[PDB]
Amino acid sequence: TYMEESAQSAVDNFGLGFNLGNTLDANGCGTGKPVATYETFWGQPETTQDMMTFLMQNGFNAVRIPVTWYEHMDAEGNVDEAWMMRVKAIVEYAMNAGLYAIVNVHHDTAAGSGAWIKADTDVYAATKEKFKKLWTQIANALADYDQHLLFEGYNEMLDGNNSWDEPQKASGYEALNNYAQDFVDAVRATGGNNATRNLIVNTYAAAKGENVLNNFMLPTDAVNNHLIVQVHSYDPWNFFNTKTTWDSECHNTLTEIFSALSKKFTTIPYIIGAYGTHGESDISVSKSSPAEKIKLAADQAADMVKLAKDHHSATFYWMSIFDGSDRIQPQWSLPTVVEAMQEAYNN
């Protein structure tokens, strides 16, 4: 049964969140393959009900489900039925487990080959109707799920130069803001539960610098309080390689980030939709990292979780805590990181 819930209520209920990363967002094997060829292409197992059940069983209340779509669309932009069914299936696993879930449009943005959604007015002109047709299909396919399911328009939209901090042209922000409006428009048009479903729109690059926040424009929505803004955080950049301890620089960096976010968005809720130790040369923590580096990861995660709580936000860990063959067991990959998160959330 669908029960309308405000965006802030949803965020307040997300609790500890997790990203099912490098899974349905994996891509690159080409078209015309069985669904599992995509889902396992970046070294994750096929997702099962047990994995979602495990998250709920262990103190997590929300899961972000990244999805990359471009190899699953025909020339007209129609989504392959096998692919849409699998997205539906993993969504249902999360719903069954009692979790909140987010479905997005993932490596259709950013620097990967195949990205086609870009913060560039010419790219926007060429792709706007394709983007709306995609969201119309996703919204229709997922329409009957209750308010625990949210839609996120796009992941990490960059300009045509893949500029990670800010677009090289100010009009890049216009394009982004227009995509965000088109996403909301297309979803709302499908009606039913989607008339009041909570929707998530991301900043440029999911970044949070002064210019990016000042040039973000929240879409107009005919219903009240059903929009959430999302940013990501791997800050201070490359700390996993340069630091042995989560020190005052690290702490102050995060406190200042949340201060800036809360002063920008006031009444509009926001989330940290992805965070972790991922730094230069995409190095990140694993269970074979030195103990000191695992502690560094735990301290980051605890700080992120408690600061988000203080700021009426919520957080979603990018991958590392529940990874690879550990998902099959199911067991945590990084139990000390999770213990720190749990302490931070429940106090």
Ligand SMILES: OC[C@H]1O[C@@H](O[C@H]2[C@H](O)[C@@H](O)[C@H](O[C@H]3[C@H](O)[C@@H](O)[C@H](O[C@H]4[C@H](O)[C@@H](O)[C@H](O)O[C@@H]4CO)O[C@@H]3CO)O[C@@H]2CO)[C@H](O)[C@@H](O)[C@@H]1O
């Ligand atoms: O380079 C490709 C790589 O980019 C990754 O994203 C990185 C950016 O590259 C990097 O420039 C960015 O650096 C942050 C830095 O970590 C923050 O500590 C610093 O913080 C400010 C904040 O911007 C202010 O809003 C706030 O008020 O104060 C704090 C503290 O002074 O801001 C800079 C950016 O200006 O970090 C990004 C990661 O978060 C991508 O993640 C990766 O995928 C790409 O390959």
Ligand SMILES: [Ca+2]
């Ligand atoms: Ca196909």
Ligand SMILES: [Ca+2]
């Ligand atoms: Ca607020």
